[PDB]
Amino acid sequence: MQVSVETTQGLGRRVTITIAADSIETAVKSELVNVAKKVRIDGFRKGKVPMNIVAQRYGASVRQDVLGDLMSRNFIDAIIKEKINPAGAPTYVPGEYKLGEDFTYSVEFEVYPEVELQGLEAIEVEKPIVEVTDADVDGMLDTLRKQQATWKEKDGAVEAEDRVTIDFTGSVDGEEFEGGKASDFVLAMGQGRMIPGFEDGIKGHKAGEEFTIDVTFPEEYHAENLKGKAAKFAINLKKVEERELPELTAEFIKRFGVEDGSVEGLRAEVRKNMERELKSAIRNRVKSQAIEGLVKANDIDVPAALIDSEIDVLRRQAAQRFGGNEKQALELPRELFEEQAKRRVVVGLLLGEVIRTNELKADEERVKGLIEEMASAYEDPKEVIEFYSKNKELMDNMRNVALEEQAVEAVLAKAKVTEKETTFNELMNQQA
Template sequence: MQVSVETTSSIERRMTVGVPAERIETEVNKRLQQTARRAKIPGFRPGKVPMNIIRQRYEDSARQEVLGDLIQSSFYEAVVQEKLNPAGAPSVEPKAFEKGQALEYVATFEVFPEFEVTGLESIAVERLQAEVTGADVDNMLDILRKQNTRFEVVERAAENGDQLNIDFVGTVDGEVFAGGSAKGTPLVLGSGRMIPGFEEGLVGAKAGEERVLSVTFPEDYQNLDLAGKAAEFAVTVNSVAAPQLPELNDDFFALFGVKEGGLEGFRAEVRKNMERELRQAIKSKVKSQVMDGLLAANSVEVPKALVGNEVNRLRVQAVQQFGGSIDPQQLPAELFEEQAKRRVQLGLLVAEVVKQFEIKADEERVRALIEEMAAAYQEPEQVVAWYYKNAQQLDEVRSVVLEEQVVDTVLQKANVTDKQVSYEEAVKPAQAPQAE
């Protein structure tokens, strides 16, 4: 087999492959012999059909199948021979494809870029330091109580924080508009759910009262037909309900799976969850800075094939996230290209750090991570056993640990400063996009 390779760009290769005619004919004859053993032709017993008849009937199709198979097999033989690492399927252009002659074709494809990760010392990372205080736990208990607020009907004027049950009809220039009417709608005053002026106009209203609210749709309203327009809403208040915070008692604790230990046991469980959230938030922000730093310090040309594959994955994820029966391929590729390119670049950089520093997943850390995830379940031992019985799930955890070890490796060389902050600041989402 003859192979020649032309470098057409830093990551594109144009490879010419020649497969000898003898190899083609040998494979065609094998295929015809296999066909002869099972061919059913009138007048002949199975396996007794003369080869000249088999060849006359089946040679053309057998040759086409052989040529297709040889292109595929010889391509992979050639890239192994030339020590190339394709990043995607090749584009194949036949050059010589005639009976009795050698098969010759040109395969154009991208390869994985070859590079070394550099500039780790230039990466600046601010590592947050925080702890969960008693006041933080108190604040979290208040949040949990508010999230489980009940509303009880009252006979008084509505105040901010009350939940009203309302009917309303909206009009613009005296005409009812689509989506501007509803019956039996619950609305918490002060929630900001409605356009400016709507909720404010219902403060002081009582059950059975009717009000007409004059409001203006914001200029940036999502419905462009209504943006910036004045409107009137005729509102009927069906009921007014005041918020009632639940007591910190056993019934409330049971909502969160805490069935013993009373208030102190519940506080301990809340603190444990907050500390886990704090560790994850700090780890995530450090990882984001490390990944941003790797990208800034290393320019990596990415194969289009890999970006295209990642775009397709993001399309599928988007459809799954937002529901519906849309074909993922109908979503424009440009919506995902920037994110896909970033993810591919990071994947290549992380893989190179693993290779460059000879990093292997620490099995003790793998076990610790699985146990930490399992701790959120009622029977953690079963969860741990499940992971160790499922090779694919276990490999996914190993990948997470491997990535954490990459971050640790970069931190050893990066410019790291520690900053003491409150729990709230530490868990607050970062302003910059998080790395995948």
């Protein structure tokens, strides 16, 4: 087998294979007897026409399909004996097929660069032991009751978490500008949509007040000479409205779906649900910082195949949410995702190398722990266990994720993984 390899497109090596005329002539003739047996022409063969004659004349049509077949079978033949580690779509640049001469063609295919795993000590991870108490579950339930709070008017002392009805005079340098007021204007606190500090005046007065506060504009204000400029606002605070922490009635408790819809039942049920979500959240916490640090420790330029596979996945994932319109995905540029797509594949190669190097397999006690801790949310998860035993495509994937988790922990073994006993709302970053 005559081949001429030249490293052209970096990882893309051009193994210019030359399939001999006899190899082609044999394979076309071998294909024609396959067609003859299929269509039963082999039985209708009178044997007065020699097979070399039908090979060149009638097999002239089939020459093309046999060439492409041979290119694929000479590719896999080549990479094994040449000890090459291939990658990408093998760019079969097909040279001119001279009928009777050799078919030369340049197979430009990429290679997999094996992952030079450097010091995993460079990785720094945090393991925050999130503790929960009755004050934490009740305080969180209080926050949820403030999300679902029925707001209603009151009169007298305003507080710093209310919303009110004012009527202000918008002024700069004490000069009221036109458009620059708002009458019966309902202003709410905490929300950083307004001017920073503008809510301040409201939060420390009565529902029968009129006063002018000194508050500075935002630097996000659409006037340079006015952005972060100290302005005057004659806040006519005419009403104040307070939230009502809703009724802790057992029927209201279970309205959310609290199956144990009692008071201590609300606290207990939401607690055991908190820990079950926090189980997966703490796993994702330590894992995400592991992966962050892993790639922060390690760099590899991946062949175009895997990156562009992830590009296409991310294009569909994006366009799905970006309208969901007909196939808009396929037009999104490589550079739209290239950095983070490469990053995704880099992790896949890092952990793939951890699997190979450390001979790290999916451990059945880790599959045990994973299934049971996930299904611990259920009292009797017959659905889950039976779905494994009746769908091995997910059951092996249960071992694949367990494989990846053990991979991460084997990397954590070398990594600077600090640990601390932290407050409840640590991983619970979003309350509003």
